[PDB]
Design a protein around this ligand. Structure first.
Ligand code: NJ3
Ligand code: NJ3
Ligand code: MG
Ligand code: MG
Ligand code: MG
Ligand code: MG
Ligand code: MG
Ligand code: MG
Lengths: 236, 5, 236, 5
């Protein structure tokens, strides 16, 4: 790997510089190199890994949606034939997106998840696994679509089971997992009722636990709770 | 699109 | 070249899709492939080429400035020693930026400029040549800095001479050239008086020629004139 | 920074 000769601490330092410079592809490559050193990641390091790939794949998803919409319009009645170029370029972007998702899943499987024993690490990585299978599901149209969807579901479910046992209802990781699993239900699994129920119950249980928190923890939890409320407002 | 983190 | 097997028209089509998707690296690679077909570029095609590389190098320049500022702060008294990483990563971004500039200059030299005979094409390409030497000058700190600056100046000057002979004072290409050459004087050549004089005279001569224009041409010219005014306001 | 096009 191209980062094999760079110190772990230097890779982390440069990931933070890349973040400041909004160079998310570089940030992701540095964090991949850091993971491949083989040591477990601290809380801050897990967050850097997640931020980097979330931003890279987020940009790819936005581009894919623009191209997919143009392609859909091209296949409407009365639309002039323009050749294979729109499909080809949508496929190019799609293949790159799938590559990034496969890279992240590969890091999780080799060997982040198997070494993660604390709830905060294990839930966080399993949430990521669910997220990157969800992004694969967004673009899937073939024979493996059901298995891809099920892989997302299974990862989210394991994360949920641990989070409910081991974390308070206001824990930001538990909240963010629930937010994203609810979106999975709505957008991927054709289960809007499940999405709504999950968001509502998560919000309400968090509300009831806010009284236990410091000012700073309260701010952290309420920020994510607002996103649950925003989605509920969108969906009702 | 809905919010995710 | 990786685009050697793709039709010229397909490369142009995909450049336009990439623009819609805000995929400027892809847009630039498609336009490079189109240039390398060896045919001259139409007005619209020249604009696509320029937009693509302007956006790619613009992002690199923004990142370079963030990193250079951090590096400058690191070399202040009382700043803790943090090792070679900031310099290394600034150098990485710098080298990539220089590579993109060299790529654009290479397309201009092989063989866009030598085949450009009409004022609108030749002035546009010479302006681009000035711009990419200016971006090289922004990061230059060594023995060739003076020659890099002079290469920018020479390209802008040839463009100016043609534009004044062959184009009306409201022509958007003449205006954009003058805007950028004025910035060259202010930021690169340590000549703020020349920058101010050029912006003022360009603005005033354009003002006097607006009466000749259609509504649509008036809108085009006045949009760029406002940028001249904005810079004058910044500088006075 | 100043405006360029
Ligand atoms: C060390 C650790 O476990 N972390 C770092 C802090 C963080 C959880 C992972 C919690 C605070 N935080 C956030 O609230 C935001 N991002 C995420 C939340 C939850 C999850 Cl599971 C993933 C990401 C970032 C913040 C700026 O905006 C809010 C809305 C979400 C960062 C991650
Ligand atoms: C065919 C040709 O010669 N072109 C396409 C149109 C254009 C000149 C090059 C003029 C209109 N235009 C602009 O005004 C903007 N960009 C540039 C202007 C001038 C130059 Cl030399 C380069 C670029 C884009 C517009 C959205 O915003 C204004 C402020 C500048 C595009 C290029
Ligand atoms: Mg070491
Ligand atoms: Mg495909
Ligand atoms: Mg339930
Ligand atoms: Mg051909
Ligand atoms: Mg250098
Ligand atoms: Mg003069």
């Amino acid at each position: 790997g191209a980062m094999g000769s760079m110190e772990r601490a230097s890779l982390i330092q440069k990931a933070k510089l890349a973040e400041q410079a909004e160079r998310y592809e570089d940030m992701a490559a540095f964090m991949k190199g850091a993971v491949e050193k083989g040591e477990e990641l601290s809380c801050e390091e897990r967050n850097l890994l997640s931020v980097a790939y979330k931003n890279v794949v987020g940009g790819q998803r936005a581009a894919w949606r623009v191209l997919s919409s143009i392609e859909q319009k091209s296949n409407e009645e009365g639309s002039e034939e323009k050749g294979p170029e729109v499909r080809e370029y949508r496929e190019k972007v799609e293949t790159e997106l799938q590559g990034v998702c496969d890279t992240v899943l590969g890091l999780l499987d080799s060997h982040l998840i198997k070494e993660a024993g604390d709830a905060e690490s294990r839930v966080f990585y399993l949430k990521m696994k669910g997220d990157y299978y969800r992004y694969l599901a967004e673009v899937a149209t073939g024979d493996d679509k059901k298995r891809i969807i099920d892989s997302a579901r299974s990862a989210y479910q394991e994360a949920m089971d641990i989070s409910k046992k081991e974390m308070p209802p206001t824990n930001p990781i538990r909240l963010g997992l629930a937010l994203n699993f609810s979106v999975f239900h709505y957008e991927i699994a054709n289960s809007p009722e499940e999405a709504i129920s999950l968001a509502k119950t998560t919000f309400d249980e968090a509300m009831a636990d806010l009284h236990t928190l410091s000012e700073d923890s309260y701010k952290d939890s309420t920020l994510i709770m607002q996103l649950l409320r925003d989605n509920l407002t969108l969906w009702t | 699109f809905p919010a995710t983190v």
